[PDB]
Design a protein around this ligand. Sequence first.
Ligand code: ZN
Ligand code: ZN
Ligand code: ZN
Lengths: 205, 205, 205
Amino acid sequence: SNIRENPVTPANPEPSAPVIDPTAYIDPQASVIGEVTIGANVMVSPMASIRSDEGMPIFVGDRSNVQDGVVLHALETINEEGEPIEDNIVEVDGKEYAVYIGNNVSLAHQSQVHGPAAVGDDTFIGMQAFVFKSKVGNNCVLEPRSAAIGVTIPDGRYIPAGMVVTSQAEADKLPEVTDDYAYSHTNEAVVYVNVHLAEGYKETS
Amino acid sequence: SNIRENPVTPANPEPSAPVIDPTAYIDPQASVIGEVTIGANVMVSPMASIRSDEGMPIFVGDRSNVQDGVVLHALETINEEGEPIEDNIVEVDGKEYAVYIGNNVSLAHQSQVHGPAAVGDDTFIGMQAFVFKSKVGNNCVLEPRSAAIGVTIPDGRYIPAGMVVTSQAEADKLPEVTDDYAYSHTNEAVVYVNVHLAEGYKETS
Amino acid sequence: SNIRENPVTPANPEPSAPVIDPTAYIDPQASVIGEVTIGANVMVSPMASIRSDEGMPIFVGDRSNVQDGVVLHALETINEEGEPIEDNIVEVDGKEYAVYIGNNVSLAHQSQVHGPAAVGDDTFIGMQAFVFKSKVGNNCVLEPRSAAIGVTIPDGRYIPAGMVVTSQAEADKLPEVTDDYAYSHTNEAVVYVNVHLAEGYKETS
Ligand SMILES: [Zn+2]
Ligand SMILES: [Zn+2]
Ligand SMILES: [Zn+2]
């Protein structure tokens, strides 16, 4: 099966199986492994790989979408000595995650979010974009081919296409999403469409 | 099966199944969904995802190749009210498409062409490259990691590796393919090889 | 099966099947085709595509890892007239390869190494990175989204995130890995974890 438990390792004594809301659609050509929670009405497309096999949960919130070829994975969060590596764990609303994807988030084709990372609600992570060791706020837009590494992206900001942001000084000066900005309504449209696609694909299964 | 119809949605009353020329080879580990036409002698490699589930056809012309990990998808072209979103439709030779890939085109590994987009004949779209909301002319070369977003690329131009072109002023001043240019003969070689690979893989099926 | 022989072509009279060490783990959702040798304790993750169908071997050394969505492929190394195209062949320790990946190498998620290319031992090829027509030395680090095209990267150097290196003058002046560098210990950690993951996944098969 393409939905599978993670293996036993020196840092993982008990295998976990994914917890998937019954209204989510997981394409048969996607792969979901290990300690993963997938919320309601989520669409996981062909060739996506969500792999949680190094400790700690990967969480994908309600009405989010994980498009074709997207990879979610995380650095080790528990060492061989059972010691939690706090640098590799993100905290959201009192709970620890390896990767936290909020509600109404679009992870567009071929993007990747690698833990430790958190992505806030109503954020569009554009095609081929990359997020690693970063917290991306709510209502953000990562344009195609942008990247955030090692930074916190404030709420309501966008990263222009192709820009690789690696310092907090840069992240603090990113431009704001405004109504006239080209991608200001992109995520709400993509979420609306993908929630309906998930329901349609479920009716073919 | 990995060749599938698209689902019924509020903007898609009738499911469509792919129309695939009998001389094309579709790898069993590729995914082809929905309103897609694939021409003669096309090779579709493992892990490619061609997904046409938001209205309007994705067309891949004769003797083109869609290499490993390539994604083709398109923005919605028909809204919930049956109204065609003309901004998301490209026109080629009197016909409307969500994504049009011409003849003798190579979409190299991990590239992505996202509709609305058209790619003219004898063009090489290099490894990891990205095309979105753009028309790429005939006899063009997108070097690896280049991108064209929101522009028209004139015939016979190349985009240097890593360059992200987002304005028409930039696109108009791209360099020309000449005989001495390093990638001037790359596409013709890749097409020749892939047409022969398609025939060889067909003989193993 | 997802482990397959390459097809007969005008430049490939005899099909080859992959040679895979019994201690390697190949995920069922990976694809391995043709003249490929995979060493001991290698982990090949979901959605990777290793395809050797244009002549000459792709070699992946012991204790290396090929992560999700990684593509390995190579340009033609033998023409239709049986003539070896020496420009497309790399030489390592007296033997010819299309792609040579050394021991203890991490090819991180969504990266791609396209032949002709060689990657030396104990090198980390970061997420979404790209190597083509290049020799990368031992103990190197390609940060996420970096690329090396047409160059030789000296031993013990790193390429900063997002940088596309296309000239030898640039490659010669890359910074050195030192103990205080952020990724100086990344590869050794990733190799340690992936060798243990390979053993755990083997125990579930
Ligand atoms: Zn990882
Ligand atoms: Zn799309
Ligand atoms: Zn190739």
